[PDB]
Design a protein around this ligand. Structure first.
Ligand code: THA
Ligand code: THA
Lengths: 528, 528
């Protein structure tokens, strides 16, 4: 055996993959649900019928349908994130990298990919778990889940297209892992789900959803938080967008049945083509088809849940990157461009903030500008570029995350917080973008170990520390082997910097700005 | 003669006063209007009937009735500001210090005292013009004007008690100066009115009032601005307070006639006793009987006037002191005390801001706290003490002054701005109060020249510079004799520090904070 495994669904043949100077076993493309094609589009996933024979798990699966990014065709910095396999609706599979020799029972790390809920692949090279599995000796798996319309369309009172289906796909994979990781050497009672962006937000959504709390132990959230403004919509909104999509394809909108049948006949690409049209406003960092607060997956509003402790209580490890805004600005705010150093004028500055705070009213926008502008240097293009980069970041990633942390820490069983602020020496994006959203993942997956990728030795050191913290936290529940990375406490809110220097512990990650967003802004907008 | 002068009202005999190593002539107590006693209380001042004989002008006049401050009885720091002569309703007189030998025609400086409109005397030792008159060879005069109820009660549609009467008294003295300073060697076409606190606000009110624009050339405003929130009330409000006072003395409130007669029978002290009761709210830095925007003295709201250029266009010299709040906090905010270093708790901090912003709503207060609190050190007593000291100062003196400057500069003929931030070495108030409101006046009047007062030599130097700037500006219109004290421009808003070091020019005095008060706060409060 070694490469032959009997799972409760059938047998699977993997491959021996080279890792550094050795090998590992890899089982790629194991199906975990029935292909949600045909009349199953938009419906919740079915558990997969067992198979006879041996499933060949030697190649990656297809990727789900999604919007291909071709804003900088050929550019590696963007291309590295695009589906590198044939897209297909039939894309619910999972991959597992297992050590050699196969362990008896060891920790498991399940990776849930990001992509703003409209994109993502498990087959990307920055998600190749061979290095982590090998260096830390853990079993690592990667899920697949429907993104976009296909995974989050939500005609609420319908069985044909209830929302959150992509969320259910995640769960189903979590189930299969629970019920079969043992045959691969993993301990089902010690699986940690980790994810970034929408993945990190999904993770926190599993910590909240009653139905998923039991299929995992601990969780890691990277630049994501379930309460982030771009991660959920009400049923009403989902309906709104669902129908709006329908009219863009000129579907009969007299009933959900008609609407849905119609959408089920359209070719996948047609859906993607008009997907970005249904948003209700001009905005940046906002996605169309996202999780809906439907009353099932989430019993109540996430805010009540956070306030009542209605969530799984384990320990979590989470964090943020220094320049979370960059990517969003560069891709859709006027004035930024990849080959320029993007100095923004006050005109484009004000245009930017409108895009970042789509729900603010005049007074709100005014309030934001007040805080983010250096009044004694009002028209400085560099300062304006940077201020915008912090508006997007604080509003959309840092401040909601800090909110989550504070409400979770009251009842969780430990919290570790990091601030990743290192720019890879080989970054191909411009220096103005800084430490970009998505850029710590190279570290967590150990790509610096690959000398051919040109990282400095000091960075190799850094990913090994990161990988260890991640692994040790997954096993133990504390990232430190027996300097200490302090626990985060509501009292003395400590966190650490995660860069190549001697570690520094700091306190109160972005308080000043975060009280503005978490307490002032909302009141303002409500009073008005 | 020398000491005998014929004025258009009658002859006056002065005194030769020692000044340093020499002498000067001083004419103290020259009447300028008919004593507003009896049935004239509350009424506008009459020009004084000429007299026969020689008026003996050898002693100071009586002081107007006012509230004596006895919060720290015997303490010089407070006592220095209390009436040092018998108070009387008969107090409209003026004083003039003239050089020896009498000049032919020279610049004139008329001092209008401060006191929040409820107090003030011209006879105080820090307003003794012998040093200025001598060192700079100018004619210096000091007015007297009714303060409190007696000078600002305002039953609008009444001839018996129209408002702004104290303001008219100032004018009348300005008239007499215009019509007779020549007999003392002064040039009526080169009189500069200077004043501090309410005096500085009065000065700006003369620059605005059509009726006074012609009796003076230039103006100096120290820690005051006509648009400061505590300097004026609407006719409605004045009526309100006028009647409220009436009920505290149980006057018949069926008519202005009854009310007024009643108030005219009360002894002066009764009025003072309940004077502070009529305010509409708990507050700090707010006075009861103040100028009313009546449509006569001020044709329109001061804001329209500022916006339309409806004001005298000459050059002005104005400024602020570093710690304008101190005195107000110390006198009526909970937690501050003279012999303690007043570390304020967040409780008293929040109590303080409520007192400083009596018109803010919850959201407004919230907005202030946001800006003035150091969120990463929330409970620091020192930081809270200081923050409050800046709330009061920025809200009540610095920010309105900067507003005035900006609107005036568009149409004035030159503007010079200073930031006085030197703490006298012999200050008897605690170090936490810093550079207190009122404390530059010692400098402007040259008391450091008096060696018996114990100032350092470096301070002697400082008052001579100050006195020169003040004198030279009064003559020329520019404080610099032919480093330069730049003009203030709306473009590059320069100002200078006025302390014993090498002069520094800075830009944009308190922009950040001032945009909050001048533009944000008001909108907020209006939207809500
Ligand atoms: N497509 C991208 C994704 C991420 N970052 C990116 C950064 C730049 C350009 C494209 C990106 C973060 C994870 C999700 C996908
Ligand atoms: N009574 C006072 C006045 C001023 N400052 C003071 C400062 C401390 C205590 C009393 C004061 C400034 C000018 C007006 C009067």
């Amino acid at each position: 055996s070694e490469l032959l495994v009997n799972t409760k669904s059938g047998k699977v043949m993997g491959t021996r993959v080279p890792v550094l100077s050795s090998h590992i076993s890899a089982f790629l493309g194991i199906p975990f649900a029935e292909p949600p094609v045909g009349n199953m589009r938009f419906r919740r996933p079915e558990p997969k019928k067992p198979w006879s024979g041996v499933w060949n798990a030697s190649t990656y699966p297809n990727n789900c349908q999604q919007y291909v990014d071709e804003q900088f065709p050929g550019f590696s910095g963007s291309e590295m994130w695009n589906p590198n396999r044939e897209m297909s609706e039939d894309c619910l599979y999972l991959n597992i990298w297992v050590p050699s020799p196969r362990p008896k029972s060891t920790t498991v790390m399940v990776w849930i990919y990001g992509g703003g809920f409209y994109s993502g692949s498990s087959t990307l090279d920055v998600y190749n778990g061979k290095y982590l599995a090998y260096t830390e000796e853990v079993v690592l798996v990667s899920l697949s889940y429907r993104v976009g319309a296909f995974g989050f369309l939500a005609l609420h009172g319908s069985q044909e297209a209830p929302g959150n289906v992509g969320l259910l796909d995640q769960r189903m994979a979590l189930q299969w892992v629970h019920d079969n990781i043992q045959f691969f050497g993993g301990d089902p009672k010690t699986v940690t789900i980790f994810g970034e962006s929408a993945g990190g937000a999904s993770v926190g959504m599993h910590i909240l959803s009653p139905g998923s709390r039991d299929l995992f132990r601990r969780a890691i959230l990277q630049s994501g938080s379930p309460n982030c403004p771009w991660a959920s919509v009400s049923v009403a909104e989902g309906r709104r967008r669902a129908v709006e999509l329908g009219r863009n394809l000129n579907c009969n909108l007299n009933s959900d049945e008609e609407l849905i049948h119609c959408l089920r006949e359209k070719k996948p690409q047609e859906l993607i083509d008009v997907e970005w049209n249904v948003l209700p406003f001009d905005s940046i960092f906002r996605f169309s088809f996202v999780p809906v607060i439907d009353g099932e997956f989430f019993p109540t509003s996430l805010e009540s849940m956070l306030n009542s402790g209605n969530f799984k209580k384990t320990q979590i490890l989470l964090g943020v990157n220094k320049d979370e805004g960059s990517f969003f600005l560069l891709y859709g705010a006027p004035g930024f461009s990849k080959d320029s150093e993007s100095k923004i004028s006050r005109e484009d500055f004000m245009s930017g903030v409108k895009l970042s705070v789509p729900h603010a009213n005049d007074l709100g926008l005014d309030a934001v500008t007040l805080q983010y502008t250096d009044w004694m240097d009002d028209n400085n293009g560099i300062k304006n570029r940077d201020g915008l980069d912090d508006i997007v970041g604080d509003h959309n990633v840092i401040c909601p995350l800090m909110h989550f942390v504070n409400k979770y820490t009251k009842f969780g069983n430990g919290t570790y917080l990091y601030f990743f602020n290192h720019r890879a020496s080989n970054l191909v994006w411009p220096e103005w973008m800084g430490v970009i959203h998505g850029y710590e993942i190279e570290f967590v997956f150990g790509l610096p170990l690959v000398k051919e990728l040109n990282y400095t030795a000091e960075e190799e050191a850094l990913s090994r520390r990161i990988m260890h913290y991640w692994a040790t936290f997954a096993k133990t529940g504390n990232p430190n082997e027996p300097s200490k990375w302090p626990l985060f406490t509501t009292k003395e809110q400590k966190f650490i910097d995660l860069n190549t220097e001697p570690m520094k512990v700091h306190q109160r990650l972005r308080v000043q700005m975060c009280v503005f967003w978490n307490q002032f802004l909302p009141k303002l907008l409500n009073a008005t």
